[PDB]
Design a protein around this ligand. Structure first.
Ligand SMILES: Nc1nc2c(ncn2[C@@H]2O[C@H](COP(=O)(O)OP(=O)(O)O)[C@@H](O)[C@H]2O)c(=O)[nH]1
Lengths: 336, 285, 336
């Protein structure tokens, strides 16, 4: 049951969310890394200052604050017992975003398997936020925050918070929590990898233009113009440049990690994308299959059906910069 | 008030011992188990007389306040006048007749905030701190000398609905004082069957009806964390609607299944309607 | 959780193995049907006579039977105590094939959920075979019988016996057995369907010639002539006729049973088979996707990439003959 070293995994999330030294922490397992990110990450926000959103408050007070609501005032007859119904703007850190952080920290502490230092430091931080109210978190709360009025920095940790909550399982005890075995399932690993490249290519490949492209079948049907029964076909990524276009399909498989038979089932999808796609520029058409491997990286090229296609792998577990170097070396060959 | 009560003798007898001591009981349970009915009849039992006058009933809601409950200043034609509440007035009758037992019925107590409502008085209504010794002047009292003291005669009944998913945590201030009691649906009980057999219901339809609902009630209790045990359906639907002497049969039942039970399942099972169809079929099929 | 009526499933196995009234039995569930087949099936063999294979026996007896083995005779000095070591041929029903039947019947009786009549009748039959020795069955035993010296009839019930043993699970009690939920998994259902058609087409479509065809990629690679990394591509079926060829890919899906989005992922495989395949005769090229549906049957045609392709479904649960009629109606349209 061999898997990727965990420290490298965190980098892939960075590109996945589109936005530090990990050598310092001695805990190989993921939650030690991610918990340290949040626990240290919170400190950066607090130094500059946490988000303060004016929440209006309509309450019954012994005096005038802001705007009096005449209707509620007389109806409750609060004038006689020296009270008014007035609307005013308390400035708090009680926003939905900040509550998530504090509620999240409870889960992080409650996790049964964790570094002692990480749990200790956060509990002070949990104590350091008295005004904010704890919450019982659901994805719908994170869903509400897609507006992103908050800064770019806030969205980073919240994206992490989204990862932790979904990847948290109750363990031995009713109260405490246990971390998900993220590594073992390919599907979430796969969706990460596809998302990892798509946002990554925008960053580094400034030379080329990169977009996900929807394609429509060349078919015509007497029955239906819809062709609803036909499969929806949406590229993982297309990375177009003036001299050559290139479509890529990448996935994480466990069998391919083994150095025997080879899993290239996704290739069946790839060719069909090439065929229905017709280039107006007509510069060239190229294809790529890239998969994760652990030990070493091997690159091949093919001339299959009049198309120039490459199958390649990357030596995950090597080093993050050389891996970053490795992709730029890779794409340059085929992007030509 | 005890001729045909579907609930077992144990709880209703246990309550009588519990209430005589603690004086602050919460009766939990699904809606449609006669939470008002059992307590209303029990109210007569503790008194021993089937008399309504001593008994009073109020339904709490989020905006129910100290003004309605106890004392408020509603206006007369020209100027403001202090107006007695329900509980405030309620005690004045009990003070005259300490030998007698006066009983206060509070439906859906969890919904409202007890503190804003009771305020000062929440200390007094606890069984120990009762009588003239614990008397306190009220908030709106112009003169300190006038006081309100809860006599020992008072017995307080609170009804709470378990069914709501929106409920997360019971109020702390509620929990410290009241003695919670769990009311089962009691779909399989002697007196409920004995009531049903007295009406023109054959044993097979009774055995069919009692058994099949038990399977459904068992399902909801089985998934403990997903849904509370108290979510399980009660029996009050089968009581009412037969006043005219109507014979209970499967033809009659299917209306209640569709009319009364179906929305109840619909809210409880909000994820997959096919799962509802699995359970609706067994009721008739 | 809707599935196919069980009685129809048995017919699909018939074509799967390549070789009766099922209305008589009142038990809808599968093992009632299959157990009744074996329990009645055994009776047909016994009437004609069970297989008797001469098994040589070398034993120490008080006399001469067949050929004396001189070596073992003198070495054990059996001459002096009136005994000989001789090789002779007892004629028994103790063959591996027949032992499987008797051992299988124990499992059938031991199955916890079963019709009373089926269990009762077999126990007599279990009693009726005294000489044969019980066995603890494994697939390796069935593997040894691939030689098939036995008649065509014997292989039928044994094929059933292969199905039952694999699809038997211990249930409530240590001793008793419980039947597998065959219907729910698509994969075994799928491999049945692919096998169901392949042997079925040989029977009915005598007009056309039907073979499974292996295909080789059009690619060339500088790295390796092997192209081991490339996917192995083997047709489900090809049904070639002089006027037109046709390749089919068929699979059993649960989502498609629902009348919404459509699962046509296998189509990606189908087109690629058409491309690498080049016809020497050059009569035509056609494609078919056929899936199982429950309620009703719908047929569509397409002109996709210069190829004439059909997507169609069959109303399983209808009736076995009309279904048999339905396929012949289906293929004739596209086979043209
Ligand atoms: N005769 C009889 N009536 C009952 C019994 N239980 C409930 N009922 C009736 O069911 C109806 C509803 O009671 P209740 O629980 O207060 O309604 P809820 O507010 O929805 O909970 C009233 O007519 C009750 O008297 C019972 O055990 N015996």
């Amino acid at each position: 049951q061999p898997v990727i070293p965990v420290r490298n995994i965190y980098y892939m999330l960075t590109y996945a969310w589109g936005y530090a030294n990990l050598e310092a922490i001695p805990g190989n397992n993921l939650l030690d890394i991610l918990g340290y990110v949040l626990n240290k990450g919170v400190l950066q926000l607090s130094r500059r200052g946490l988000e303060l959103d004016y929440n209006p408050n309509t309450e019954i007070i012994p005096g005038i604050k802001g705007r009096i609501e005449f209707a509620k005032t007389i109806r409750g007859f609060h004038l006689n017992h020296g009270k008014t119904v007035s609307t005013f703007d308390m400035l708090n850190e009680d926003t939905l975003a900040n509550r998530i952080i504090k509620s999240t920290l409870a889960i992080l502490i409650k996790h049964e398997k964790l570094n002692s230092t990480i749990r200790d430091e956060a509990r002070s931080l949990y104590r350091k936020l008295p005004g904010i109210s704890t919450l019982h978190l659901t994805p719908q709360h994170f869903s509400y925050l897609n507006g992103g009025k908050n800064t770019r920095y806030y969205k980073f940790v919240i994206s992490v918070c989204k990862f932790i909550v979904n990847n948290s399982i109750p363990g031995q005890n009713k109260g405490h929590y246990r971390f998900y075995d993220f590594e073992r399932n390919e599907k979430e690993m796969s969706l990460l990898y596809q998302k990892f490249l798509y946002e990554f290519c925008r960053r580094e490949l400034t030379s080329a233009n990169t977009t996900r492209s929807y394609l429509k079948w060349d078919a015509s049907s007497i029955s239906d113009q819809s062709l609803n029964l036909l499969p929806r076909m949406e590229t993982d990524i297309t990375i177009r440049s003036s001299e050559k276009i290139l479509i890529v399909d990448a996935k994480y498989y466990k069998s391919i990690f083994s150095r025997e038979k080879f899993h290239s089932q996704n290739l069946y999808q790839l060719m069909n994308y090439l065929w229905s796609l017709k280039p107006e520029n007509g510069e060239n058409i190229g294809g790529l299959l890239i998969y994760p491997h652990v030990d070493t990286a091997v690159k091949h090229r093919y001339k299959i059906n009049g198309f120039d296609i490459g199958l390649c792998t990357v030596n995950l577990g090597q080093e993050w910069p050389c891996i970053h170097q490795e992709l730029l070396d890779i794409f340059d060959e085929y992007l030509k | 008030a005890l001729n045909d009560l579907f609930i077992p003798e144990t709880t209703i007898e246990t309550i009588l011992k519990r209430l005589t001591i603690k004086k602050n009981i919460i009766l939990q349970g699904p809606p449609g188990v006669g939470k008002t009915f059992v307590a209303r009849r029990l109210a007569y039992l503790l008194t021993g007389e089937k008399a309504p006058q001593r008994v009073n009933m109020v339904q709490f809601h989020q905006s129910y306040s100290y003004e309605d409950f106890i004392q408020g200043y509603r206006p007369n034609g020209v100027g403001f006048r202090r107006k007695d509440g329900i509980f405030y007035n309620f005690c004045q009758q009990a003070k005259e007749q300490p030998e007698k037992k006066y009983i206060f019925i509070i439906d859906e107590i969890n919904r409202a905030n007890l503190s804003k409502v009771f305020g000062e008085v929440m200390m007094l209504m606890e069984h120990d701190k009762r009588g003239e010794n614990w008397s306190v002047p009220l908030t709106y009292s112009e003169n300190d000398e006038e006081r309100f003291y809860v006599p020992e005669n008072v017995y307080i009944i609170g009804l709470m609905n378990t069914a709501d998913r929106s409920l997360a945590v019971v109020d702390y201030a509620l929990r410290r004082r009241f003695s919670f009691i769990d009311i089962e649906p009691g779909f399989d009980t002697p007196q409920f069957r004995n009531f049903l057999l007295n009406k023109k219901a054959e044993p097979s339809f009774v055995e069919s009806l009692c058994q099949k609902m038990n399977e459904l009630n068992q399902e909801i209790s089985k998934e403990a964390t997903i849904l509370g045990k108290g979510f399980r359906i009660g029996h009050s639907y089968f009581c009412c609607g037969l006043e005219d002497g109507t014979s209970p049969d499967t033809q009659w039942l299917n209306e209640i299944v569709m009319t009364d039970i179906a929305p109840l399942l619909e809210e409880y099972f909000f994820d997959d309607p096919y799962k509802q169809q699995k359970w609706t079929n067994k009721l008739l099929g």
